[PDB]
Amino acid sequence: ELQVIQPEKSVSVAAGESATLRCAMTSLIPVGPIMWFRGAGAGRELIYNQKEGHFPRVTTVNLDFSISISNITPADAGTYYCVKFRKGSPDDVEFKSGAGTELSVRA
């Protein structure tokens, strides 16, 4: 079945630069959205979703789900996960997560 590839375990970024967070899926099946989160708890923060939501700091770089986050500050430090969902009803359901990429900030 599908695997989620986050080739970087960590990215060091100087404050004020952009951060590139890389992700690929190995398959298009099951159909469902790919999202980026900061954190892996229930309280994780949605960082990017393609079809819905407003994410002004995020640009996408199909099996490539890599993103760029503009103007990084120390507050952006954390671990970022690229997560595949399967379509569900009423809600989509998490199918697989990438390993996470830690964003560290050089102040």
> In the complex, which residues of this chain contact Cl ion (CB under 5 A)?
30-31
Checking 56-65 for CB contacts under 8 A at 24+ apart, the result is: 61/20, 61/22, 63/24, 63/25, 63/26, 63/28, 64/23, 64/24, 65/23, 65/24, 65/25, 65/34, 65/36
**Gap between the Cα atoms of 27 and 96, Å rounded:** 12
Instruction: Output 54 or 62, the one with its CB closest to Cl ion.
Output: 62
Query: Rounded to the nearest whole angstrom, what is the least distance from the CB of residue 31 to Cl ion in the complex?
Result: 4
Query: Rounded to the nearest whole angstrom, what is the least distance from the CB of residue 52 to Cl ion in the complex?
Result: 20
Token readout for 79 is 């671990």
Instruction: Output 48 or 85, the one with its CB closest to Cl ion.
Output: 85
Instruction: Output 34 or 103, the one with its CB closest to Cl ion.
Output: 34
Query: Rounded to the nearest whole angstrom, what is the least distance from the CB of residue 89 to Cl ion in the complex?
Result: 13
Instruction: Output 30 or 33, the one with its CB closest to Cl ion.
Output: 30
Query: Which residue's Cβ has the minimum distance to Cl ion?
Result: 30
